[PDB]
Design an enzyme around this catalytic site. Structure first.
Site, PDB file in Angstrom:
ATOM      1  N   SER A 132       0.836  -1.209   0.000  1.00  0.00           N
ATOM      2  CA  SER A 132       0.000   0.000   0.000  1.00  0.00           C
ATOM      3  C   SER A 132       0.878   1.271   0.000  1.00  0.00           C
ATOM      4  CB  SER A 132      -1.047  -0.055   1.086  1.00  0.00           C
ATOM      5  OG  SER A 132      -2.138   0.777   0.737  1.00  0.00           O
ATOM      6  N   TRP A 157      -0.162   2.230  -3.259  1.00  0.00           N
ATOM      7  CA  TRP A 157      -0.953   3.451  -3.091  1.00  0.00           C
ATOM      8  C   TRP A 157       0.015   4.615  -3.284  1.00  0.00           C
ATOM      9  CZ3 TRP A 157      -1.371   8.064  -0.531  1.00  0.00           C
ATOM     10  CH2 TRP A 157      -2.622   8.551  -0.155  1.00  0.00           C
ATOM     11  N   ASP A 178      -9.410  -4.788  -4.871  1.00  0.00           N
ATOM     12  CA  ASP A 178      -8.935  -3.792  -3.935  1.00  0.00           C
ATOM     13  C   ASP A 178      -9.892  -2.599  -3.968  1.00  0.00           C
ATOM     14  OD1 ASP A 178      -7.392  -1.750  -2.586  1.00  0.00           O
ATOM     15  OD2 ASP A 178      -5.648  -3.023  -2.926  1.00  0.00           O
ATOM     16  N   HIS A 209      -7.672  -5.884  -0.623  1.00  0.00           N
ATOM     17  CA  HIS A 209      -6.535  -5.006  -0.400  1.00  0.00           C
ATOM     18  C   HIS A 209      -5.353  -5.746   0.281  1.00  0.00           C
ATOM     19  CE1 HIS A 209      -4.146  -1.465  -0.135  1.00  0.00           C
ATOM     20  NE2 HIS A 209      -4.260  -1.375   1.189  1.00  0.00           N
TER      21      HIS A 209
HETATM   22 CL   LIG Z   1      -2.014   2.572   2.922  1.00  0.00          CL
END
Ligand SMILES: [Cl-]
Length: 262
Positions: A132, A157, A178, A209
């Site tokens: 992430s 991310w 996700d 996720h």
């Molecule tokens: Cl995150």
């Protein structure tokens, strides 16, 4: 001929298993420098120096989310440091500087005679992983440090998706379903922005996720792929070219893509 080769000739079975051929030990870093906390995993008997990989978790998360990689990668002949960040709320750039601070401290310990990793690390051969925001952080590290030999972020991310400058061989794990870092606006545009590297996109079918974290139900494939990628690019080990670049042709994989990978 290949001096960075370690371990016996890989098979699907030997890379699908929970442990590779080397014995693993760990210790907690005593005075972490530039990051909040660290756990270091290392093979006792790799038959030579190995590279170092620094792994970073997501926003509000901890080592627990990415620990399984520690034993898994070290057992196949790597030094792995898993970190906690200075703040649970650090953004991907800060996660990056702390990722690189961890590699800097592993390089130092390799030079310290009282350290369990004294002389075990090739400090010219490092790579980066993270989940992430820690994934986004991994991509920022690779952009800033083209000497890294490999990156393999998971469910990344970043509000900036342009990584076109990255020359480091990069494997993106994505999670089909996700909804935190949706693939359509995170992983995929990120993959698609890189035009100067060996790269790979591997989307876990029905994955949420957390599809690549400790306890995921695809450890056989995710772990096989992660190890093959680091063996191929961090060790230049062409015994792993097939495992690293092939399409798994698997119903566990919903989207596969690779470029510049033979
Ligand atoms: Cl995150």
């Amino acid at each position: 001929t290949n001096p960075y080769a370690r371990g016996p000739n890989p098979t699907a079975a030997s890379l699908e298993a929970s442990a590779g051929p080397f014995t693993v030990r760990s210790f907690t870093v005593s005075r972490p420098s530039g990051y909040g906390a660290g756990t270091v995993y290392y093979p006792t008997n790799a038959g030579g120096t190995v590279g170092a990989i620094a792994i970073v978790p997501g926003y509000t998360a901890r080592q627990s989310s990415i620990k399984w990689w520690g034993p898994r990668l070290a057992s196949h002949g790597f030094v792995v440091i898993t970190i906690d960040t200075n703040s649970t709320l650090d953004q991907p750039s800060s996660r990056s500087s702390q990722q690189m601070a961890a590699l800097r401290q592993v390089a130092s310990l390799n030079g310290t005679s009282s350290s369990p990793i004294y002389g075990k690390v090739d400090t010219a051969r490092m790579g980066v992983m993270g989940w992430s925001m820690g994934g986004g952080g991994s991509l920022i590290s690779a952009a800033n440090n083209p000497s890294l030999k490999a990156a393999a972020p998971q469910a990344p991310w970043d509000s900036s998706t342009n990584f076109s400058s990255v020359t480091v061989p990069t494997l993106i794990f994505a999670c089909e379903n996700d909804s935190i870092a949706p693939v359509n606006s995170s992983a995929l545009p990120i993959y698609d922005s890189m035009s100067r590297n060996a790269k790979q996109f591997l989307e876990i079918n029905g994955g949420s996720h957390s599809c690549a974290n400790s306890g995921n139900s695809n450890q056989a494939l995710i772990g096989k792929k992660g190890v093959a990628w680091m063996k191929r690019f961090m060790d230049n080990d062409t015994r792993y070219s097939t495992f690293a670049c092939e399409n798994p042709n698997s119903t566990r994989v919903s989207d596969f893509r690779t470029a510049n990978c033979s």
